[PDB]
């Protein structure tokens, strides 16, 4: 009936992107979703989903959805997945085992990399815990290995983390910047939000 659609192009076609640690958390509400246009993208395109057949969504009428996306170095696109170990998995982003939905991955070689190399993306390195899936974590304090009070001097065993990436203009696919978006919509259907 209604001709109003969900604003999605501004996210997929965004002016710029987010950082490896931290992310935007965008909320969509009260509109219709047509992901068929999402089929139109670069041939390097990974769309693998859990909890539902990938095409039978438009007839569904489930609850709210959350939006967030970021960029990761090439090889470990498999390393992000439900409930398996990994440095980025246990330190930056974990996915619940019983997760419904999926993620979308593709290549952004020419848009990101510079000839000298762009240093703009970076990730945590020495978290002394294993964060649960889907909790915020933003912080800049220098890590301490414990023991004695390094007291903000950045000496031995008291390391400042992160170690931003390289993004060389030419390199193998293993260390090639890939843009990924993690899509998460809830269920229980009572706050029906988007539908089709």
């Amino acid at each position, epitope marked *: 009936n209604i001709t109003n659609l969900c604003p999605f192009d501004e996210v997929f076609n965004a002016t*710029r992107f*987010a950082s490896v*640690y*931290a992310w935007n958390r965008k909320r969509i509400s009260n509109c219709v979703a047509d992901y068929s246009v999402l089929y139109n993208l670069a041939p390097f395109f990974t769309f693998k989903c859990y909890g539902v057949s990938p095409t039978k969504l438009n007839d569904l009428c489930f609850t709210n959805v959350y939006a967030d996306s970021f960029v990761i170095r090439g090889d470990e696109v498999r390393q992000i997945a439900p409930g398996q170990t990994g440095n980025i998995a246990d330190y930056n982003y974990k996915l619940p085992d019983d997760f419904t939905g999926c993620v979308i991955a593709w290549n952004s070689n020419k848009l990101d990399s510079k000839v000298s190399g762009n240093y703009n993306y*970076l990730y945590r390195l020495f978290r002394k815990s294993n964060l649960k899936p889907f909790e915020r974590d933003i912080s800049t304090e220098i890590y301490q290995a414990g023991n004695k009070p390094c007291n903000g001097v950045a*000496g031995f065993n008291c390391y*400042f983390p992160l170690r931003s990436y390289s993004f060389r203009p030419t390199y193998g696919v293993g260390h090639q910047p890939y843009r990924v978006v993690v899509l998460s919509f809830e269920l229980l259907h009572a706050p029906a939000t988007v539908c089709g």
Partner: antibody, heavy 126, light 111 residues
Framework: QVQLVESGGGVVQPGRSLRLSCAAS????????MHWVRQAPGKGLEWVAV????????YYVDSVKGRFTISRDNSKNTLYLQMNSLRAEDTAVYYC???????????????????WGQGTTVTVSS | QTVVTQEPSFSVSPGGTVTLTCGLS?????????PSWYQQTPGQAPRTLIY???TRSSGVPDRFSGSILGNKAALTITGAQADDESDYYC??????????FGGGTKLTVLG
């Protein structure tokens, strides 16, 4: 044209208070973070104060904790710096600088400043 | 408290290529600290030269390049010119409210 006007500079007796004012032309201060940085003759630049684009948090340097204040006004696009408990070492020229925005979402501990105005001088003299 | 170290002053004949270094006395400098390079002429306002450690500011001539050498932020200048004599400053970032400058360096062209 993106321009910043600093006013309120002058010579004041030690221990008094003053309000330095900064006017912005060209853009709205609500979309950017602002920096006050001072430089003394015969010395190098020294970081003084900053305010983020959202006004949520405010940081200072150890030498200035608990004695000065920074504030901003979105309605009239003004930037106020309250100087209290002045001492002779603060005699210097101050500048107001403008940095990146939430318009360009970059990681935290924001990268600072791209261009600034002429600044104004203050002399804590007895 | 961390202190950033810089060379006091260099003098180079026109047309040459020179390197300026900014270092950390307490450890290594990484791109996470985000080195920035600014220039100032006395009595005037400083002008943005380099941010991003490899990106030139708008309108800046391509004769200046930035990089990292070992643990030191490095600025390379090709074709020394008279107007380039000035004070030069590095800016380094510690997380959430601690940004520090170096000792400064006065660059003079042998004219």
């Amino acid at each position: 044209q993106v321009q910043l006007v600093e006013s309120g500079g002058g010579v004041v007796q030690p221990g008094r208070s003053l309000r330095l004012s900064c006017a912005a032309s060209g853009f709205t201060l609500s979309s950017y973070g602002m920096h006050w940085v001072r430089q003394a003759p015969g010395k190098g630049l020294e970081w003084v104060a900053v305010i983020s684009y959202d006004g949520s948090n405010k940081y200072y340097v150890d030498s200035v904790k608990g004695r000065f204040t920074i504030s901003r006004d979105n309605s009239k696009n003004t930037l106020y710096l309250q100087m209290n408990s002045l001492r002779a070492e603060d005699t210097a020229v101050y500048y107001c600088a403008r940095g990146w925005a939430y318009w360009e979402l970059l990681p935290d501990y924001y990268y600072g400043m791209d261009v600034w105005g002429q600044g104004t001088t203050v002399t804590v003299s007895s | 408290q961390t202190v950033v170290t810089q060379e006091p002053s260099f003098s180079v004949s026109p047309g040459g290529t020179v390197t300026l270094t900014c270092g950390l006395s307490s450890g290594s400098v990484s791109t996470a600290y985000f080195p920035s390079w600014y220039q100032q002429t006395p009595g005037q306002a400083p002008r943005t030269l380099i941010y991003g450690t490899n990106t030139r500011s708008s309108g800046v001539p391509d004769r200046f390049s930035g990089s990292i050498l070992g643990n030191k932020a490095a600025l390379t200048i090709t074709g020394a010119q008279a107007d380039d004599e000035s004070d030069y400053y590095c800016v380094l970032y510690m997380g959430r409210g601690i940004v520090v400058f170096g000792g400064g360096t006065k660059l003079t062209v042998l004219g």
